[PDB]
Design a protein around this nucleic acid. Structure first.
Ligand SMILES: [K+]
Ligand SMILES: [K+]
Ligand SMILES: [Mg+2]
Ligand SMILES: [Mg+2]
Ligand SMILES: [Mg+2]
Ligand SMILES: [Mg+2]
Ligand SMILES: [Mg+2]
Ligand SMILES: [Mg+2]
Ligand SMILES: [Mg+2]
Ligand SMILES: [Mg+2]
Ligand SMILES: [Mg+2]
Ligand SMILES: [Mg+2]
Ligand SMILES: [Mg+2]
Ligand SMILES: [Mg+2]
Ligand code: NA
Ligand code: NA
Ligand code: NA
Lengths: 153, 88, 187, 100
RNA sequence: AUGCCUCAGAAUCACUGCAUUGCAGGAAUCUGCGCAUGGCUCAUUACAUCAGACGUAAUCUGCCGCCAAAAUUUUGCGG
RNA sequence: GAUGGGACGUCCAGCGAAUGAAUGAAAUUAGAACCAACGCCUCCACCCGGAGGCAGUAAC
RNA sequence: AGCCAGUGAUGGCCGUGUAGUGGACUGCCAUGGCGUUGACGGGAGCGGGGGAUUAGGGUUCGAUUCCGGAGAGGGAGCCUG
């Protein structure tokens, strides 16, 4: 008689506005499984360029993250860096630290330096301080954020 | 009225210049349409329509080339499958 | 005037940046349109590189899409009922992107009758159209919330265009869990 | 490189609508000649086999462009030899017998 | 010290030279393009500017190159 | 009466722009049996009506 | 020797504005961000290619021809393109 009625998730819809992916329509039931995960839900995911694999959490998850490299319109291009997780206090953001040696020509010796960078982390990753991450350059996402986490080792 | 000569109704003003006979000044008439201008207007449309027709010909030749290559590939596949069937 | 540069901002260290050079035309901003709801009124703006932007002021109609049926109709907006930014926008009746509005449902009722033969003029149809209706209705199902709203005379939709940039108020009807999410808030 | 069409006794009718024509009205089109099997192929064309090779030559004549329930009835000659169809049929029957 | 006329946008100067109801040159104005380049100086300025390496899949782009174009019931006459 | 086949007529169907839907590939296993209608091949010389099976087979 | 948050400081959500990204900007939410590897403040100073002095390592100058930036007494606003 009538089509079945879905229900709100209540574990991801905890904001003032309805959270949704802009790439697919969750209300369309089509005969082709173009964008369908193992659970049968409609979910959009893609492969980023270089030799990086899309995590299974991204394909089979339920978060939204309109800033995610694997499930949104953010594109990775530029340079690739590695660092050490320094702090994970902000929401969906972490601070990584890069340590390097600088060469002083007059004394023929090295000295230690460091630099702090703030990056965006998708919910498919769960880094902790002391971990090692690989990040890739993207378009400006905030006042100080220019990188996205691609892999946690 | 329409289709009436206008080339001699234009007035001429006499300028009495010393040392020679008076010059007569008449304006140049604008928007005078002759047979050469009519042919010039009509050539533009026929040249334009030939350009779009020769572009349709170029598209047809490209489509024929694409179709011929796919026909050959299907024929080769059918021959392989046909040979496999009769070798059973 | 208004600028969009980072020169007036503090550094991450908290220090103050000493500004040399003046303000450039390439980084200007402009005053917001603040589109209201009413008889149509627009104002052209000459943007960079030529080209014209249209400022929406008091729009009242647009094209609204029925996503499930992949159609659209031209309908008149009746009122604004919700806004995720602040209640002040709902109170002042401001049309912006993602605003929740209601529409008159008359065009969508007419389309449903002429496509499926169900009336929420039908009996005067050709036999081959009647046969086509039976096929379409064979494996088509409407949902509770949509059928109730179409009978009532209004249904909810969200604005999909940016009225202050293009001067158009277009949107999509609400369906699925999105309809349930906003119905519970509107209670 | 001889033409493979003459001496065929098989004809081709281009605009024949099998959903509004039936075989009885198709056979009426040729009345003075004995008719072998008739085939229709859903792309609106048909094949008609005739007994004598001496036939179907004046049938191709005085019939190209004439009206047959509309559509102008384009008609030509086709190879489609009946003898080769019979051998294909008995080979298919033999092949199906081996399969089952 | 920034203006620009060719065979090829617009001359009835009551402008000039020859002819004798024309042929040329054409002051002035309208139109189109440029004046955001060049030249000068070094006051400001340390997550700024600059240099080496990279991006714009986050965008705009006249002049220049190679190209493209099948929308549109108009006009005359008799009503 | 047939999501039956052909005509006839009556509204749309150009580039660019706005909103919504579809396309923008696949690359982790091998054989069978029934019912719906779709395509072909054989009969009973054709037609009539009334039978029985997958030789081949990019799509239309 | 501590700096940053009324009035944006670091991040998140829906938007506005821009040619376009972005706390660039409005509303709401969390307590974050930087620092003895010298932040914050002060002094001198347009940056570079390069010049001077040459065992080697170094020290010092670069307003000035080329490249980049900024300005037209001071400082603000804008039209046409
Ligand atoms: K945003
Ligand atoms: K210009
Ligand atoms: Mg001249
Ligand atoms: Mg001018
Ligand atoms: Mg200059
Ligand atoms: Mg460089
Ligand atoms: Mg036309
Ligand atoms: Mg100075
Ligand atoms: Mg210098
Ligand atoms: Mg000085
Ligand atoms: Mg000098
Ligand atoms: Mg000097
Ligand atoms: Mg200047
Ligand atoms: Mg002075
Ligand atoms: Na003229
Ligand atoms: Na210096
Ligand atoms: Na310069």
């Amino acid at each position: 008689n009538y089509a079945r009625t879905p229900t709100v998730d209540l574990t991801v819809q905890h904001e003032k506005a309805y959270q949704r992916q802009t790439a697919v329509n969750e209300n369309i039931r089509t005969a082709s499984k173009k964008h369908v995960n193992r659970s049968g839900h409609i979910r959009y995911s893609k492969k980023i360029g270089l030799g990086f694999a899309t995590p299974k959490a991204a394909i089979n998850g339920k978060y939204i993250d309109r800033k995610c490299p694997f499930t949104s319109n953010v594109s990775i291009r530029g340079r690739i860096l590695r660092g050490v997780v320094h702090s994970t206090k902000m929401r969906r953001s972490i601070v990584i630290r890069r340590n390097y040696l600088h060469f002083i020509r007059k004394y023929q010796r090295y000295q230690k330096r460091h630099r702090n960078i703030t990056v965006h982390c998708s919910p498919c990753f769960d880094p902790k301080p002391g971990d090692e991450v690989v990040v890739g350059q993207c378009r400006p996402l905030s006042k100080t954020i220019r990188y996205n986490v691609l892999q946690v080792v | 009225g329409r289709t009436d000569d206008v080339r001699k109704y234009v007035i001429r003003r006499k300028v009495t210049k010393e040392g020679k006979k008076d010059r007569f000044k008449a304006p140049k008439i604008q928007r005078l349409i002759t047979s050469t201008i009519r042919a010039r207007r009509a050539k533009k449309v026929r040249v334009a329509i030939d350009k779009v027709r020769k572009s349709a010909a170029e598209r047809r030749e490209y489509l024929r080339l694409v179709g011929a290559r796919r026909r050959a590939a299907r024929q080769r596949k059918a021959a392989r499958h046909h040979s496999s069937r009769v070798n059973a | 005037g208004i600028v969009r540069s980072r020169l007036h901002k503090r550094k991450i260290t908290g220090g103050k940046t000493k500004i040399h050079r003046k303000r450039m035309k390439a980084e200007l901003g402009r005053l917001p349109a603040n589109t209201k709801l009413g008889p149509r009124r627009v104002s052209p703006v000459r943007a960079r590189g030529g080209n014209f932007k249209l400022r929406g002021l008091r729009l009242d109609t647009g094209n609204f899409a029925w996503g499930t049926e992949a159609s659209a109709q031209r309908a008149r907006i009746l009122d604004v009922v919700y806004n995720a930014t602040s209640n002040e926008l709902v109170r002042t009746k401001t049309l912006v992107k993602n605003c929740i509005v209601v529409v008159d449902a008359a065009p969508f009722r007419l389309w449903y009758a002429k496509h499926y033969g169900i009336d929420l003029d039908v009996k005067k149809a050709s036999s081959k159209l009647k046969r086509k209706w039976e096929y379409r209705r064979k494996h088509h199902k409407i949902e509770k919330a949509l059928a109730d709203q179409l009978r009532e005379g209004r249904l909810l939709a969200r604005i999909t265009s940016r009225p202050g940039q293009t001067g158009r108020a277009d949107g999509a009807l609400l369906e699925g869990a999105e309809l349930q999410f906003y119905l519970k808030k509107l209670d | 490189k001889p033409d493979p069409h003459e001496g065929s006794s098989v004809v081709f009718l281009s605009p024949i609508f099998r959903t509004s024509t039936t075989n009885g009205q198709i056979r009426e089109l040729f009345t003075g000649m004995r008719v072998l099997r008739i085939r229709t192929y859903r792309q609106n064309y048909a094949y008609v086999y005739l007994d004598s090779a001496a036939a179907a030559q004046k049938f191709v004549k005085e019939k190209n462009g004439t009206e047959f329930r509309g559509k102008k009835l384009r008609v030509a000659l086709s190879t489609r030899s009946l003898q080769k169809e019979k051998d294909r049929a008995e080979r298919a029957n033999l092949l199906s017998d081996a399969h089952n």
